[PDB]
Amino acid sequence: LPEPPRFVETQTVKQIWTSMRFASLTESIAVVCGNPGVGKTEAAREYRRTNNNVWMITITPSCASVLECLTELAFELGMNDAPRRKGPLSRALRRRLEGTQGLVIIDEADHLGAEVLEELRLLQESTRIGLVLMGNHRVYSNMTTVEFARLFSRIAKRTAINKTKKADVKAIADAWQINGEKELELLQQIAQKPGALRILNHSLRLAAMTAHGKGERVNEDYLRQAFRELDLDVD
Amino acid sequence: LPEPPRFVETQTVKQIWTSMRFASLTESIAVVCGNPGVGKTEAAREYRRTNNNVWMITITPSCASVLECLTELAFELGMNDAPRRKGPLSRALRRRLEGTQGLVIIDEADHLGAEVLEELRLLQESTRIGLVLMGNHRVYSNMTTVEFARLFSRIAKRTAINKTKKADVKAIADAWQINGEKELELLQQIAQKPGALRILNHSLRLAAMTAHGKGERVNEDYLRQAFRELDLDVD
Ligand SMILES: Nc1ncnc2c1ncn2[C@@H]1O[C@H](COP(=O)(O)OP(=O)(O)O)[C@@H](O)[C@H]1O
Ligand SMILES: Nc1ncnc2c1ncn2[C@@H]1O[C@H](COP(=O)(O)OP(=O)(O)O)[C@@H](O)[C@H]1O
């Protein structure tokens, strides 16, 4: 019956915003390597939503080249007049973004070739801007160890988040107006299982839509009815 | 009138034989980087002349590839039936030289590409043998720094010889039967100028052929007559 919150600031969100603003204002490269289902994509989306001079793209294996990634960057910077070449595209990206004190955000940096990430680091080094990587722990694990070693000298900042926190899901429950202590422990048990923010928000929206359709309050019984579903331990 | 010595053991020769036998019996890679005119080529030739299970090739820019270098190696190992391919040539070189406890000697390793020296180090690592490099100081200076870094872990031994020694030219003068103290100082002055063994042996053979043609002994005057030639300080 109250509003379902689309987002809440957490301890992990306040950490990743600190590292984000650090990589931007420092104008240096930071890696966010950690297991997904923790919210780094939506946190970076929230940062780009709240703050200007911030740019965030995604990288697919269908867009794993240098040219496709720079085309994504040209679409993100607001330039539909991107040349199909690699050279003058790169120099136009260098022209547009110089002096902006901007921030480039890279999601799924584990799908990168060495030439692609090398062109991105030489780009940001020739632009005096900040670069932020996302993905699993393989993003850092592809570097330990000699081809990204100068990049390992440029990579100074990383905040690695494997699993969530107690105050993390506590602030989430505060956003969703949850005060049951057994409910708190059950949400922590949800946070124990992987895909934590995903499975958590699934269970929360199931319980919320159930409590609105039945006209009631989300209780621990609606949490068991939601979390008992989704077939997580089914092989 | 006595015999002109083709070779003498020196302190530098005893050092480079120690490093040579070390790289061979250790079955690991050693670098000899230093300015030429010091005798490393003739010392390695002397080592191969005195000792069995020892192989020494040269590398030209006309033979700077992997295939040409392995063809040189196949000629050096006594196999005229070398295939023109790169694969079965390399495996035949691996077959012939395994269990031999041999020594490969490389002259002018400064002309090497990374693929060539990488194939040589993977060869010797797949053969359990010793590899010895020669050349100027650029041989080590091409590594400081990430592509030969694992090779920098395999390169443990190096003896760098820039200039000669006092006992060096003293033993040379003892081979050439020289007992003048001013003659000793003048030979040291020859050793000060670069191309030391080359210019030294040039001056020695000029003085020796002069003393045989005039029927006399090599004196300090024949040393001035030889060393005053060769036009070293002429631009
Ligand atoms: N503050 C928040 N409150 C609730 N859910 C969040 C919050 N931030 C992120 N999420 C959740 O994170 C999920 C996506 O992030 P995630 O899959 O962890 O990204 P990545 O796959 O890059 O690690 C979304 O389903 C979203 O519900
Ligand atoms: N023991 C020795 N006595 C006299 N001369 C020597 C001796 N060893 C080497 N040399 C001289 O070294 C010269 C060639 O070696 P060098 O040019 O220094 O090889 P590199 O060019 O590989 O450094 C020859 O001219 C030879 O006269």
Give the span between the Cα atoms of B99 and B163, in whole angstroms: 37
* CA–CA–CA angle B139, B143, B149 (5° rounding): 130
Give the minimum alpha-carbon distance from B144 to chain A in angstroms, rounded to a whole number: 13
Give the span between the Cα atoms of A107 and B194, in whole angstroms: 59
C-beta atoms of A150 and B146 within 8 A: yes
Dihedrals φ, ψ of B121, to 5°?
A: -75, -35
| Helix H or strand E encompassing B55 | strand B55-58
- Provide the experimental method for this PDB entry: cryo-EM
Establish whether residue B191 lines the binding site of ligand 2, counting it when its CB lies within 6 angstroms of any ligand atom.
Answer: no
Give the span between the Cα atoms of B103 and B124, in whole angstroms: 9
What Å resolution does this PDB entry report?
A: 4.4
Closest ligand 2 atom to B43 CA = 8
* Residue B91 near chain A (CB below 8 Å): no
B196 alpha carbon – ligand 2 mean position (Å)? 9
CA distances from A227 to A42, A56, A232 (A): 22, 32, 9
Contact B115, B66 (CB under 8 A): yes
Cβ partners under 8 Å of residue A3, min gap 6: none
* Residue B150 near chain A (CB below 8 Å): yes
Give the span between the Cα atoms of B139 and A36, in whole angstroms: 47
Give the span between the Cα atoms of A161 and B192, in whole angstroms: 64
B103 alpha carbon – ligand 2 mean position (Å)? 21
Which residues on A lie below 8 Å from B147 (Cβ)?
A: 146
* Beta strand ranges found along chain A (DSSP E): 29-31, 55-58, 103-107, 130-133, 157-158
Dihedrals φ, ψ of A65, to 5°?
A: -85, 180
Q: Which residues pair with residue A186 across a beta bridge?
A: none
DSSP state of B4: P
Give the span between the Cα atoms of A45 and A76, in whole angstroms: 13
| Helix H or strand E encompassing A153 | helix A149-154
* Residue A114 near chain B (CB below 8 Å): no
Three-state secondary structure call for residue A14: helix
Angle formed by the axes of helices B87-97 and B114-125, to 10°? 40
Residues 208 through 227 of chain B touching chain A, CB cutoff 8 Å: none
CA A68, chain centre distance (Å): 20
Closest of B115, B111, B137, B120 to residue B58, by C-alpha: B111
* Residue A147 near chain B (CB below 8 Å): yes
C-beta atoms of B149 and A150 within 8 A: no
| Helix H or strand E encompassing B158 | strand B157-158
* Residue B114 near chain A (CB below 8 Å): no
Q: 């409590």: which residue's tokens?
A: A211
Pocket test for ligand 2, best of B14, B31, B41, B46 (most atoms within 8 A of CB): B41
Give the span between the Cα atoms of B12 and B171, in whole angstroms: 11
- DSSP code string of B159-174: ----S--HHHHHHHHH
Positive/negative CA dihedral, B72, B75, B80, B86: negative
Can you read off the two tokens belonging to residue A13?
Answer: 């969100």
Can you read off the two tokens belonging to residue A219?
Answer: 């209780």
CA distances from A216 to A186, A202, A207, A208 (A): 20, 18, 10, 9
Cβ partners under 8 Å of residue B139, min gap 6: B31, B32, B33, B109, B110, B133
Closest ligand 2 atom to B175 CA = 3
Pocket test for ligand 2, best of B201, B205, B230 (most atoms within 8 A of CB): B201
B144 alpha carbon – ligand 2 mean position (Å)? 28
Q: Which residue in chain A has the smallest CA separation from B149?
A: A146
Helix ranges, chain B (H):
11-26, 40-50, 66-76, 87-97, 114-125, 138-141, 149-154, 166-175, 181-192, 196-213, 220-227
Establish whether residue A42 lines the binding site of ligand 1, counting it when its CB lies within 6 angstroms of any ligand atom.
Answer: yes
B41 alpha carbon – ligand 2 mean position (Å)? 6
Three-state secondary structure call for residue B182: helix
Angle formed by the axes of helices A181-192 and A196-213, to 10°? 140
* Beta strand ranges found along B82-155 (DSSP E): 103-107, 130-133
Positive/negative CA dihedral, B135, B137, B142, B147: positive
B90-96: long-range contacts, CB 8 A cutoff, minimum separation 24: B90/B119, B90/B123, B93/B123, B93/B127, B94/B123, B94/B126, B94/B127
Cβ partners under 8 Å of residue A113, min gap 6: A64, A65
Please report how many Cα atoms fall inside a 13 Å half-sphere around the Cα of residue A206, on the Cβ side.
17
Give the minimum alpha-carbon distance from B33 to chain A in angstroms, rounded to a whole number: 24
Helix ranges, B98-180 (H):
114-125, 138-141, 149-154, 166-175
Instruction: Give chain B's count of helices (H) and strands (E).
Output: 11, 5
Instruction: Bin A108: left if φ > 0, else alpha if -120 < ψ < 50, else beta.
Output: left
Determine the straight-line distance between the first and last CA of chain A, rounded to whole angstroms: 36
DSSP state of B58: E
